[PDB]
Design a protein around this nucleic acid. Structure first.
Ligand SMILES: NC[C@@H]1O[C@H](O[C@H]2[C@@H](O)[C@H](O[C@@H]3[C@@H](O)[C@H](N)C[C@H](N)[C@H]3O[C@H]3O[C@H](CO)[C@@H](O)[C@H](O)[C@H]3N)O[C@@H]2CO)[C@H](N)[C@@H](O)[C@@H]1O
Ligand SMILES: [Mg+2]
Ligand SMILES: [Mg+2]
Ligand SMILES: [Mg+2]
Ligand SMILES: [Mg+2]
Ligand SMILES: [Mg+2]
Ligand SMILES: [Mg+2]
Ligand SMILES: [Mg+2]
Ligand SMILES: [Mg+2]
Ligand SMILES: [Mg+2]
Ligand SMILES: [Mg+2]
Lengths: 24, 60, 98, 155, 120, 127, 78
RNA sequence: ACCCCCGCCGUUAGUUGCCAGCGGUUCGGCCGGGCACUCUAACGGGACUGCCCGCGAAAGCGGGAGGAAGGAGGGGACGACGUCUGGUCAGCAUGGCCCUUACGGCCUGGGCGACACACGUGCUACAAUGCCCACUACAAAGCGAUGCCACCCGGCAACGGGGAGCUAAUCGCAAAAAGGUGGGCCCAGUUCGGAUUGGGGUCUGCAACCCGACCCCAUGAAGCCGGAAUCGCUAGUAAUCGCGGAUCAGC
RNA sequence: CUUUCU
């Protein structure tokens, strides 16, 4: 999970934001 | 090299990203706290002496 | 109407310096919302003790900016005398606002 | 424990049936500090005891445990040459811990895909006397006693 | 049923099942399941021939896939051989391509391990 | 008209006001059961009431901010207890033996340098 | 990877453009491996420094998007 | 022991706290108003084996009450004479020896990033006590005017346009995540896992081939819990979940 | 248990 850029969790861990984790 | 270089790092350079920090005492590139211009070493030193104001042994 | 922020590294030279600004406005004027102590900004620095490799083993330093606040509501000129230049700043900061 | 004999960590009674032994179990169920999910499971499992029998869950669990407690075990032992398996009686604490340890390991060996179920069936099977827990146990009581020649150490 | 190249997804949800094509990930599946207006939850097993067509037509024509790709990608790397670029060697050598370390790791791109000798 | 206890447990503080009569409990402008929803542990926070038979012969209004929900629960547990002792000298005899009155000063211990985590040390090889 | 320029060294361009106005030279050597090969400035032979010497990289059409140093490999037997 | 942090209470203090009380509320402590409470930060109090039972010559030991807290309450800071000819002359300082159109200097470029291999420390896993998607306040240390960027709009997005507030308990980074509520997957090398690789982009920077991070499409490797060996942890610990900082253009 | 050498 945490290692997957295309999950939401992958994003969190990576600190990033994107399609798979939007800013509200 | 550490003389020709304490000198070079003060010169304003072509491109600001060639720029960098240096312990203004102990003339040194690495672990250089920007709030002081001070190398972790030449710093623990002053911090001990009382020559860094309000700075104190943290203990919590 | 008048607002004064007080910074400083030393907590005795605020609870002193700015608790004497409570007498130099109460005696020579009107109302004061007493000295109010603010959240302090702790800075912590963490240093490898030795000059060369001993990466576990460190020393821990903080640098603690204490903040205090005072508010005076009625601007007399009987007050802005001590509160103008009857000077005892020492190692203290002075912010003056309205 | 070189100095003292260690205080038996004393446990919050149960939120629901009011019993200490239950928290103990919920705790062995619990991973990574997730007491909530752990407790859902044990309660969800207690509800599966209801629907699949007119039995009160509490006294199923009680009596399952009582069936998984070993009487004797074999602790390994140096004899200035050889290590032998030495049979000896089992502290009431250790009875109780090993029981609940095995209940949950037994539970999680099962096929059923959902934790509350595995917990439930294993419990059922155990009160009856035929859970995987009880085999991992008659296995122990067997091995001690099948080493009864060395009962003349005990240390 | 059969969709592209020669693929036959089956029995599972379509969103999943589309994935079974070389060219379809979880994303391109969403795209083509609303651009044809098919509920994604429906199993392939039970989804209209009218739906299968809508789908099949969009897919084969919207973007390059299965086998066409397989040969394209292969031809990009062939192209990287050219007169002889850097990423060329790397593909030529069976070594990593994206600026990674090789002193350790790099196993995904290398023959399991080829252990040797050494030392006195 | 009013009853008060301040609860704390581990970064959580519990501002607790009891009232006479009904039985129902507000927490941060919310029913107890919709705030502590799903959280098995919650029924413990009111354990002080069941102790003295206050069951539901009081309402309660509670603000509770800080820390965490298991913490909040225990903070309350404490307020609720500190509240009704301050509305009955005699509510020690039942509430102290079960120590709903104790603070419980167990708190997150500090990350140390050298260590990974307070105590978890790093890992020897010696080879 | 950029999109507002191709960040190519003028000292090379300038020397290549003002060779294209009549210019078919091979003794064109550079140290700017960091510059993109620019729209069809092909045909020519640029020698690129790997940090030890210049290597003649013959520049053709298929390889235009790329950088120059992609053809001056810096390390030996890899 | 004398010092700092954390547990309980008191005093002093009201641009952070509040229907706690009552009033108005476009129902956001937002508005007049109020420090009660919470907190913030300064100063005090509090614990002494002082009190009760038992043992003891005594120190002290077991138990009990009161108390937020007992018998070192919990975490720091704090390292005897000395040991290792330990470590560092590459932080600095410094005795001696050696280089002085070079063992000094400046630059561009490459290298410190090599890869047939071996080891240490780590991350992500190998799944259903789980994975995915949506909704849903748990709260808790720090940073921010060559800065933190709310809010609008364009872009699937990274990011790009604009643009308010904040020298910051006032404004921003900030979503905490685990949890909770619903929905999906149904035990599959899988909707587990996210290596590798093709392609398209964004940003910092003179410049991202050798060498950056990020986003998006595609591609989905090994991996089904690990041989002999072997590591940490005794409680708010381990286990697990996110959050901040320093250095720093970016990483 | 086990331990020759260094
Ligand atoms: N000021 C020096 C610093 O102290 C550090 O802390 C060290 C010690 O003070 C600390 O304590 C030791 C521990 O080392 C050792 N392996 C086991 C022992 N039980 C610990 O002692 C423990 O108990 C004592 C007294 O009860 C405490 O005061 C002590 O700090 C605590 N860590 O553990 C650390 C080393 O294992 C480091 N020694 C050192 O890197 C650093 O220089
Ligand atoms: Mg995945
Ligand atoms: Mg730099
Ligand atoms: Mg380390
Ligand atoms: Mg922790
Ligand atoms: Mg080689
Ligand atoms: Mg030596
Ligand atoms: Mg150079
Ligand atoms: Mg290196
Ligand atoms: Mg499997
Ligand atoms: Mg010999």
């Amino acid at each position: 999970g945490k290692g997957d850029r295309r999950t939401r969790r992958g994003k969190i861990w990576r600190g990033t934001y994107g399609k798979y984790r939007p800013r509200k | 090299a550490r003389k020709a270089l304490i000198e070079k790092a003060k010169r304003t350079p072509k491109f600001k990203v060639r720029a960098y920090t240096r312990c203004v005492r102990c003339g040194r590139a690495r672990s250089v706290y920007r709030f002081f211009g001070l190398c972790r070493i030449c710093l623990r030193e002053l911090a001990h002496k009382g020559q860094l104001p309000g700075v104190r042994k943290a203990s919590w | 109407k008048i607002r004064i922020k007080l910074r400083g590294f030393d907590h005795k030279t605020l609870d002193a310096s700015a608790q004497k600004i409570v007498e130099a406005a109460r005696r020579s004027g009107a109302q004061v919302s007493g000295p109010i102590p603010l959240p302090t900004r702790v800075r912590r620095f963490t240093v490898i003790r030795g000059p060369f490799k001993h990466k576990d083993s460190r020393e821990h330093f903080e640098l603690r900016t204490h903040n205090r606040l005072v508010d005076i509501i009625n601007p007399n000129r009987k007050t802005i005398e001590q509160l103008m230049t009857l000077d005892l700043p020492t190692g203290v900061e002075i912010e003056i606002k309205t | 424990a070189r100095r003292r004999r260690a205080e038996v960590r004393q446990l919050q009674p149960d939120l629901v049936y009011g019993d200490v032994l239950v928290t103990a179990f919920i705790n062995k169920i619990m991973r990574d500090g997730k007491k909530n999910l752990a407790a859902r499971i044990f309660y969800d499992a207690c509800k599966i005891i209801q629907e699949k029998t007119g039995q009160e869950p509490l006294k199923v669990f009680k009596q399952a445990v009582e069936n998984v407690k070993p009487r004797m075990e074999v602790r390994s032992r140096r004899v200035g040459g050889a290590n032998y398996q030495v049979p000896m009686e089992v502290s009431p604490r250790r009875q109780q811990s090993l029981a609940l340890r095995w209940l949950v390991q037994a539970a999680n060996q099962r096929p059923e895909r959902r934790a509350a179920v595995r917990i439930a069936h294993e419990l059922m099977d155990a009160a009856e006397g035929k859970g995987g827990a009880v085999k991992k146990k008659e296995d122990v009581e067997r091995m001690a006693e099948a080493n009864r020649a060395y009962a003349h150490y005990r240390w | 049923a059969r969709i592209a190249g020669v693929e036959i997804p089956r029995n599972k949800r379509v969103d999943v099942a589309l994935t079974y094509i070389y060219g379809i990930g979880k994303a391109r599946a969403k795209e083509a399941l609303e651009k044809t207006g098919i509920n994604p939850a429906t199993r392939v097993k039970d989804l209209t021939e009218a739906e299968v067509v809508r789908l099949r037509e969009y897919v084969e024509n919207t973007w390059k896939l299965e086998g066409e790709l397989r040969a394209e990608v292969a031809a990009n790397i062939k192209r990287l051989m050219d007169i002889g670029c850097y990423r060329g060697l790397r593909h030529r050598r069976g070594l990593p391509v994206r600026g990674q370390r090789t002193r350790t790791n790099a196993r995904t791109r290398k023959g399991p391990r080829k252990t040797v000798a050494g030392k006195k | 008209e009013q009853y008060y206890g301040t609860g704390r447990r581990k970064e959580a503080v519990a501002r607790v006001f009891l009232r006479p009569g009904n039985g129902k409990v507000t927490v941060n402008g919310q029913d107890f059961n919709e705030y502590f929803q799903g959280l098995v542990r919650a029924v413990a926070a009111l354990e002080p009431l069941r102790a003295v038979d206050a069951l539901g012969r009081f309402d309660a209004y509670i603000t509770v901010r800080g820390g965490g929900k298991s913490g909040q629960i225990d903070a309350i547990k404490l307020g609720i207890a500190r509240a009704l002792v301050q509305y009955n000298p005699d509510y020690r005899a039942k509430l102290k033996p079960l120590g709903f009155l104790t603070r419980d000063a167990r708190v997150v211990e500090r990350k140390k340098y050298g260590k990974h985590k307070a105590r978890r040390a790093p890992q020897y090889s010696k080879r | 990877s950029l999109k507002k320029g191709v960040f190519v060294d003028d000292h090379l361009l300038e020397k290549v453009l003002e060779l294209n106005a009549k210019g078919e030279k091979r003794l064109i050597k550079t140290w700017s491996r960091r510059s993109t090969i620019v729209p069809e400035m092909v045909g020519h032979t640029i020698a690129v420094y790997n940090g030890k010497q210049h290597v003649p990289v013959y520049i053709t059409e298929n390889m235009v998007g790329h950088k120059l140093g992609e053809f001056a490999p810096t390390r030996t037997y890899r």
